Design a binder for these strands. Structure first.
Lengths: 23, 136, 59, 79, 49
RNA sequence: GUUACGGCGGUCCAUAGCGGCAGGGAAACGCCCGGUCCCAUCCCGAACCCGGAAGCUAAGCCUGCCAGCGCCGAUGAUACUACCCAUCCGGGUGGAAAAGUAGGACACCGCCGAACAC
RNA sequence: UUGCCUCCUAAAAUGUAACGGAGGCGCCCAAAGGUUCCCUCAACCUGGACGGCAAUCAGGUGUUGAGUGUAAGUGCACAAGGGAGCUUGACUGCGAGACGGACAUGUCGAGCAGGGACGAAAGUCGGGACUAGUGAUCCGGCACCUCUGAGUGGAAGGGGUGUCGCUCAACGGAUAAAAGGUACCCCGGGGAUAACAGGCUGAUCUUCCCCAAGAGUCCAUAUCGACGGGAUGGUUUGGCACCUCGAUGUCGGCUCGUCGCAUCCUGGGGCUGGAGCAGGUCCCAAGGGUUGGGCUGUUCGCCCAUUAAAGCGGCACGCG
RNA sequence: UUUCUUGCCGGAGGUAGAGCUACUGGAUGGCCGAUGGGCCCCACAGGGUUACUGACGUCAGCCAAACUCCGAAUGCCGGUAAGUCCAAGAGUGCGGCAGUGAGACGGCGGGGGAUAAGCUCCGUGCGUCGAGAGGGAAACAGCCCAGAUCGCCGGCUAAG
């Protein structure tokens, strides 16, 4: 759970603009 | 419980949880009401729990209205079954609730008791909900 | 009037209509500028690619 | 445990084929439809399968008569 | 069966000119009907074969 | 040229309809009487024909007025939305929906025929 | 399940997938086709012996309702719906133009022959209200033909036209003709695809709150807590099929560990629902320890004798 | 220039939104007032009597994907002006010689799933990766900026 949560939430960065591959 | 006598189509697409409620957003029957603030598929079991909570808090007097009706069937496929092989059978009866929709209404002489009963109902509900009043 | 339209952003990630509006304006690279008439056609092109260009009124 | 559904006919590609203002030739199919959603107007015939076709050359126009949508052909002035 | 593909042939040119369905139960007897014989160049009575 | 007189025809076919109140017969539109005459009843001269003016505008017809029912119905706003901006929210530019009240409306023109005075 | 038709999904052109949601099919009609003409009640009253939810019926309006070969869009008192006549548009045989849709499919203007209706009146109306009601080619028939006729005076021995024969229903139809077993298996490949493990998810599972209804001899919260609600964790069963099928060895036991705390001693709070005590329930603070046997494949368990206790899990269900 | 972009013009839609007394399936009230059961007056004429099962109807109120009295925005089909001007390396037709017919994720609109999956299946003149280096996202195909012809002891910036 933690791994997916972190990988997903790191899209909430100014560089990514709320989007990342594979969420 | 609340279950439709019948539905024209028993396997329906999920109600679209979008936009604020366009109708039923004001207390039209009672003096106080519970206004939803988030989208949720409020099930007939949740409606039953909320109305029983309100009725048991107001005890003897008072009148309760349940504006939403759970007439939308959410289906569930049998447990431990793979994806495919058709759509599941109807499992839950839900009312598509949107923000601003008044779900329950209450008339009761005592304002504190009415608000406490509506608070009971809100705690039973799966969404953020506030106590609105007819007096605008 | 006259509009000086300078492409500030890139066509990478831009839609087909936006890229075609840019080339219709005459903009092929970032920071390229074109002086055009402030007519309805120019305003429509600017509206389509507004996020990709900066527009100034030529004195 | 299976689904009783899964069948469907071919899409019949109905609808308007020549819209308002389009210049058409005589005998050109204007509307593929089931029934008279549009009715044959002026210089427009109705096919056996409800296909509205132009009877004369001209430009397609859509009108309303007795509250019924109709497809007409307006003659085009010779150049 | 039921609705056989009967063949209508003319009486004069005796040409099997048409083929059409007919419910044998409702119309058991040979279907005599006026049709066009191209050989004769005119409408002639045709009956089932 | 005119009439509450006529038919024929008129619209993205109700702003025209429904209903209520009031009015008209010189000629038209009607109403109407008996089956010698074409014609018709899945039976019936009720619908279609014959002779009509002894009699009538009751109804249809049309005229005026009622916004009651229906109909139309803005501007504004909202919903929604194309594009754009925006880390989760949301916002900008453009477009933009029924109800209602404000409201509109008891419809809107040409051909020809009759009498009127010329 | 497989082909065709209708709808929704389908995101207001068209088209659009899923073992998505619903149904139909694949017939039927010689009078349910053509033409010409005409129509006219869905429901209250008065009633109409019997004959009320119904008669043969009569009126009014219900304003276009209503109902109407077979599911959507249409067709209405401009009737595609309901009756009637014709005698066979039962309009068939030769069919520029255009077209809509890969082949296949589908639309019709219009010209000619012959007719059918309507006729005075016009000269007007190409199967069914429309989309399903079907099967290519091959190969064979069967009728007709101004074709051919293997030297022909010549004929017999093939073609053209229109028609027939497939639940070829796996419905673009591999043969005219065909079911299985393989753990005795083999080979070519695949992590394109399953079993283990890993990964994502967390329905299930596991551990955790409330307006607390109620139970707890008196009392919601000492202990609990229904009806509902919200999450944690990733130890179960799953879902997915993302690494691995030119190999990532499985369960259990042994050996050796290491880590987490979701506590089986050491410290506390409440209950003192111990008024009190010996005891015990509940909730907050990993250093060590946490037995030996029997029956268990036994992952589980139960049992015997102890123990301060005989913890729960992760580590490829740690460790070949 | 038939392609494409923009403006304008003509056009058919039934989606988003709603609206439902506008249809097909629903919702708290009382109402002239249906079987009226029930008191019965004591008619088996005929009639109030309805504490309760509550007809049609009616009152503000609510939903739908296979509902629609309505109904956008976009998209699409045409016409017209231009713009793109050493043309897009455009569209079309005919011959090239193909490979491709395993896609991935992200944003939006959806189906299946539990409105879980880095799930699955669609749509998207949507993007990117595939086939894309460079900068930012610590690392990090698909996110953001930006499309690398080659050099430079140059300058300005993008996202950060």
């Amino acid at each position: 759970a933690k791994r997916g949560r972190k990988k997903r939430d790191r899209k909430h960065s100014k560089a990514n603009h709320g989007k990342r591959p594979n969420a | 419980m609340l279950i439709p006598r019948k539905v024209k189509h028993r396997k329906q697409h999920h109600p679209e949880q979008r936009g604020i409620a366009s109708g039923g957003t004001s207390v039209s029957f009672g003096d106080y009401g519970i206004q939803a603030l988030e989208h949720a598929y409020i099930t007939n079991r949740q409606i039953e729990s909320a109305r029983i909570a309100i009725n048991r808090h107001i005890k003897r007097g008072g009148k309760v209205w349940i504006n939403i009706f759970p007439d939308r069937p959410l289906t569930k496929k049998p447990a431990e079954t793979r994806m495919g092989s058709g759509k599941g059978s109807p499992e839950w009866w839900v009312a598509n609730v949107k923000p601003g929709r008044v779900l329950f209404e209450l008339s009761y002489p005592d304002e504190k008791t009415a608000r406490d009963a509506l608070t009971r109902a809100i705690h039973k509900l799966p969404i953020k909900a506030r106590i609105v009043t007819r007096e605008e | 009037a006259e509009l000086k339209i300078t492409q500030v952003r890139s066509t990478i990630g831009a839609r087909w209509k936006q890229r075609e509006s840019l080339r219709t304006l005459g903009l092929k690279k970032i920071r390229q500028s074109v002086v055009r008439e402030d007519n309805a056609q120019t305003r429509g092109l600017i509206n389509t690619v507004h996020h990709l260009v900066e527009v100034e009124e030529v004195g | 445990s299976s689904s009783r559904n899964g069948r469907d006919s071919a899409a019949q590609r109905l609808g308007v084929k020549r819209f308002g203002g389009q210049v058409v030739k005589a005998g050109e199919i204007l509307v593929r439809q089931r029934g008279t959603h549009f009715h044959p107007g002026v210089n427009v015939g109705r096919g056996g399968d409800d296909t509205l076709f132009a009877l004369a050359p001209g430009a397609v126009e859509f009108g309303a008569k007795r509250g019924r949508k109709t497809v007409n052909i307006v003659p085009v002035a010779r150049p | 069966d039921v609705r056989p593909k009967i063949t209508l042939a003319c009486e004069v040119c005796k040409h099997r000119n048409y083929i059409t369905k007919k419910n044998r139960r409702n119309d058991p007897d040979r279907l005599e009907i006026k049709k066009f014989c191209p050989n004769c160049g005119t409408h002639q009575p045709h009956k089932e074969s």
